[PDB]
Amino acid sequence: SALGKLQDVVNQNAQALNTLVKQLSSNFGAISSVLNDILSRLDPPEAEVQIDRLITGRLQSLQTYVTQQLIRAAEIRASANLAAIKMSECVLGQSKRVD
Amino acid sequence: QIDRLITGRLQSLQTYVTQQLIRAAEIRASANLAAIKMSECVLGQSKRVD
Amino acid sequence: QCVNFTNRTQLPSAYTNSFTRGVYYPDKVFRSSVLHSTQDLFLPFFSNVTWFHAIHKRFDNPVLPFNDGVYFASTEKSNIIRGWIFGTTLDSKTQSLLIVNNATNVVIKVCEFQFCNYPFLGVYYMESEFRVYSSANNCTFEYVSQPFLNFKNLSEFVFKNIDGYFKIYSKHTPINLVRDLPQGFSALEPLVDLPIGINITRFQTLLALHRSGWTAGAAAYYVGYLQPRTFLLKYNENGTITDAVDCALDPLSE
Amino acid sequence: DSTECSNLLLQYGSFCTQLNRALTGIAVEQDKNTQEVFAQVKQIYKTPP
Amino acid sequence: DSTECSNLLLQYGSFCTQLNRALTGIAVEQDKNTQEVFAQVKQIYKTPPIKDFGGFNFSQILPDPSKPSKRSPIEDLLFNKVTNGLTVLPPLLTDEMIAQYTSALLAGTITSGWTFGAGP
Amino acid sequence: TKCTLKSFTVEKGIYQTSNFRVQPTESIVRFPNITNLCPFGEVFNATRFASVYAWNRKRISNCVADYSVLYNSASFSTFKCYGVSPTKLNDLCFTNVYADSFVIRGDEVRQIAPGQTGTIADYNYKLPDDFTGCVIAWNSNNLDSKVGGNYNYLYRLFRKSNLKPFERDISTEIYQAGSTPCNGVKGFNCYFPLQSYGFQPTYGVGYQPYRVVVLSFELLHAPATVCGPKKSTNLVKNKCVNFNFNGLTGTGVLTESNKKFLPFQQFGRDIADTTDAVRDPQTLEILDITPCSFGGVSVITPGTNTSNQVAVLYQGVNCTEVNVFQTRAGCLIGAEYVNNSYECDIPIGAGICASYQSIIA
Ligand SMILES: *[C@@H]1O[C@H](CO)[C@@H](O[C@@H]2O[C@H](CO)[C@@H](O)[C@H](O)[C@H]2NC(C)=O)[C@H](O)[C@H]1NC(C)=O
Ligand SMILES: *[C@@H]1O[C@H](CO)[C@@H](O[C@@H]2O[C@H](CO)[C@@H](O)[C@H](O)[C@H]2NC(C)=O)[C@H](O)[C@H]1NC(C)=O
Ligand SMILES: *[C@@H]1O[C@H](CO)[C@@H](O)[C@H](O)[C@H]1NC(C)=O
Ligand SMILES: *[C@@H]1O[C@H](CO)[C@@H](O)[C@H](O)[C@H]1NC(C)=O
Ligand SMILES: *[C@@H]1O[C@H](CO)[C@@H](O)[C@H](O)[C@H]1NC(C)=O
Ligand SMILES: *[C@@H]1O[C@H](CO)[C@@H](O)[C@H](O)[C@H]1NC(C)=O
Ligand SMILES: *[C@@H]1O[C@H](CO)[C@@H](O)[C@H](O)[C@H]1NC(C)=O
Ligand SMILES: *[C@@H]1O[C@H](CO)[C@@H](O)[C@H](O)[C@H]1NC(C)=O
Ligand SMILES: *[C@@H]1O[C@H](CO)[C@@H](O)[C@H](O)[C@H]1NC(C)=O
């Protein structure tokens, strides 16, 4: 568990990708989660409604994924800014700052 | 009708979680600053101005 | 022809532990080196499974409910157990399912059989005795296939009836344990899918007599009932289920 | 406590798991923040009488 | 690949452009972060062939010539101990170049102290 | 790039402008091998047929029924299908098939139809109005007629009431046309129900014997198992094709697989529940399904003030699937690799950078 911070970031990113891929299997209230099944089983007046339900569900999932990706990007950017400050002040000089 | 209630409540809950995450990031930044101040002002004497 | 068995010895049926048996493949999909969570009609781990004996004078053929599904385990030697009866009323009023495994082949018939109270097969010391039903009037489905089959052989079967589909799962295990179910894990492969499309609430075990009255060969079987629950299955590099977790058994497995 | 509502809610997938996981991450993050700020000494020092 | 789905998706506007732009910004931000952390020297410093540092041993942190990856034993241990329209873009700086940057920083701080961070 | 950036001047850099998709080329529809044919030889090619009254009924279940062999035969005079068309019989699937076989006259073939009237429909063989199936009839003057007269085929001439659909009457009880009881003797007003057709070869075409097989197709709430055979388009590997294996459809590149399936398993899924392995139903071999290549299309250019030369990067796409150079980032077209190392001007990725001096990478 020495390298838990990097493994934590890798696991969070992989878990977000796995959840985003898994969200395609959900129908979001439609008859099926497969577009081909809806297009082959229903007439276009009701297939348009079913495809619209799938589109809004998948778009909500993608927007949610992008939102947590942006939040994690901000957190990683803050950590990287801290790492650059530590590289400048601890490696390239001697720091009087305690701890 | 239940589907309309579900989508409205789910949108509300996702919105609440989104601002909770943003406030969590802000509080985490403030706590990191507080930890730096605890290390450098309390546990030592700091030459950093202000 | 029907024959009443009047030489039985009265004894209560036993109960024992299921351990980690009764797991079957939920679908026909290959999965390798993965952990898959599935919600299906499964047999709970460490459950109370009913134990019936055939020893001499015990001959256990009671009337048992089917419920959502039946796990049937058999610690068998010398081939006494021959088949099963499924139905609701077990007469000509409703339509019933017959599965038999005689000396040559396995026969599945869906007919309105007028069943005997004590249906049985017989071996003379060759098979020359068959007393299961007195009539068969309306037959819709027939399926003839290959033979499916100290206690030396363990046969596990799972019978389910969902959406007009009769799923039979089977597994054959070489064992050398004397009296009870061995403790271990063995995933049941799917054996057959039958389009019977009939209502089933009651089932019967079919046995075979030994004649040289009658004598019952040494055999033992176990009946368990399926419940809807979630399992976490582990697939190895060769696609074989090697371990399982009951999601609702205890907080550790949860 | 509506069973029908939960059955319809299951069609949307793992949104609830995502929200619970995010809230759990925030909840453990608060404790981590308190550890980082206040638990910087492993010796409990005391003043003289 | 559904044409009807894309035709219905065009009714919602430029949501897809927003999501792609945000992901592109994150992707360039990661490379900017790696540049900010590791690319702080414009000179690639190297250690002398004779490792006479007055008794100080830096073999566990200097790059190993025997390894093809040109990593330190500590860095090699660190790399060993970490294990539908989606694409993964490679990082701009590869692992060997990042290791080369760390090697340059190590050589600068060993042979020159803090002088290389403030000038020549 | 100008279209994407909404500007007529493009600053120096790399801009992701489009996407590339290897479009599918063929459709591969592999279903299982044609085995277990339905016993149509024992119905049509029978050595003797039954009479119209005691008409033979054979129930056909759990096999593969190839109806195109019957439709494309030239030996049948009537192939009139009611309630279904012959072209989709070889596609559709039914729970059971009822094959009724009998012999009637030439002029009596028209009465084997929904909504008709006559002696055969009223007293011998009645078809329902809601009938789905086919009536196949052919001349059998060669087999069923002899020079002395063939009296083996009979028909019920009378009965008190009309038959129900798919009813068989084999009773030999004396018809009572009058008030007086017959008492088993064919006297006055009391006649015998079954009358023979004295089939002779020299008869007219409206009186010659015709063998009729009526196939009745019903759909019941049980799963339909008597399915017509499907075909197998020649498998194409190493190309982006649309695959349909046993009802599982998709688009992908089908390559050889080293995964050893268990005999009961047909498809393969990864962690993310996507189908990445499959078993061919015709030949028991395992095929990997690699998704068809998709990638970002990025344009690498200097300023339009400097030059109009551009390079195209296909991200994560091999160069054989699109001044062509292969990078770890993808395939770069329009730039030439130089062994020299310079400062990074336009970032490509994986240590690769581009610059203008022509465009070099
Ligand atoms: C074997 O025993 C069973 C039960 O004792 C007999 O079934 C009974 O048959 C009688 C017919 O007179 C019915 O009135 C009872 O209701 C039946 N009981 C049950 C539980 O089914 C069966 O007939 C016996 N077999 C023979 C051949 O006599
Ligand atoms: C610096 O430290 C390294 C490692 O601690 C020393 O390398 C060891 O040398 C001895 C004697 O030659 C070997 O038996 C060990 O197996 C070496 N260890 C490793 C990890 O290679 C090295 O000798 C030390 N001194 C100098 C001047 O480099
Ligand atoms: C099984 O059930 C019987 C009665 O039904 C009971 O006596 C026995 O204790 C049970 N066994 C277990 C392990 O619960
Ligand atoms: C087994 O049953 C089948 C079907 O009834 C029959 O054809 C066969 O002869 C039987 N075999 C023996 C040995 O009785
Ligand atoms: C079942 O059989 C009885 C008599 O054998 C018959 O009257 C009835 O119509 C039959 N039902 C079906 C559905 O075949
Ligand atoms: C099946 O039979 C049981 C009892 O005979 C009855 O309660 C149930 O409703 C039946 N189900 C169907 C689908 O007929
Ligand atoms: C998997 O199969 C290989 C042979 O292909 C065998 O060597 C290996 O031991 C098997 N692994 C397990 C866990 O059965
Ligand atoms: C029946 O006989 C005809 C004529 O001899 C022949 O062409 C046909 O192949 C036979 N079989 C079937 C199934 O029609
Ligand atoms: C399928 O039929 C072909 C001949 O068309 C044969 O070569 C092949 O072995 C068969 N496969 C199976 C699994 O029966």
Author numbering:
A (entry chain A): 943 to 1041
B (entry chain B): 992 to 1041
C (entry chain A): 14 to 69, 77 to 145, 153 to 176, 185 to 247, 257 to 298
D (entry chain B): 745 to 793
E (entry chain A): 745 to 827, 856 to 892
F (entry chain C): 299 to 620, 641 to 675, 691 to 694
Task: Quote the passages of the study that discuss this structure, keeping the authors' original sentences.
SARS-CoV-2 utilizes a trimeric spike glycoprotein for attachment to the host cell receptor angiotensin-converting enzyme 2 (ACE2) and for the subsequent cell entry step which involves the fusion of host cell and viral membranes. Given its crucial role in the viral replicative cycle, the spike protein represents an important therapeutic target and is a critical antigen in host immune responses. All emerging variants contain defining mutations within their spike proteins, with multiple mutations clustering within the receptor-binding domain (RBD) impacting both ACE2 binding and antibody neutralization escape, while mutations within the highly antigenic loops in the N-terminal domain (NTD) across these variants reduce antibody neutralization. Given the rapidly changing mutational and antigenic landscape of the SARS-CoV-2 spike protein, a structural understanding of spike protein mutational effects and the discovery of broadly neutralizing epitopes is of importance.
To identify structural mutational impacts on ACE2 binding we next determined the cryo-EM structures of variant spike-ACE2 complexes. The resulting maps were obtained at average resolutions of ~2.6–3 Å. All mutant spikes exhibited slightly higher affinities for immobilized dimeric Fc-ACE2 when compared to wild-type. We did not observe major differences in spike protein expression across the variants, and all mutant spikes tested demonstrated marginally enhanced ACE-2 binding potencies relative to wild-type. These complementary assays demonstrate that the totality of mutations within each variant S protein enable slightly enhanced ACE2 binding, suggesting a contributing factor for the increased infectivity observed for these SARS-CoV-2 variants. Superposition of local RBD-ACE2 complex models revealed no significant structural changes. These structural findings confirm that mutations outside of the RBD do not modulate the positioning of ACE2-contacting residues at the receptor interface via allosteric mechanisms. Our structures of VoC S proteins in complex with ACE2 demonstrate minimal structural changes in the RBD, reflecting its functional constraints in cell attachment, only permitting mutations that preserve the ACE2 binding interface.
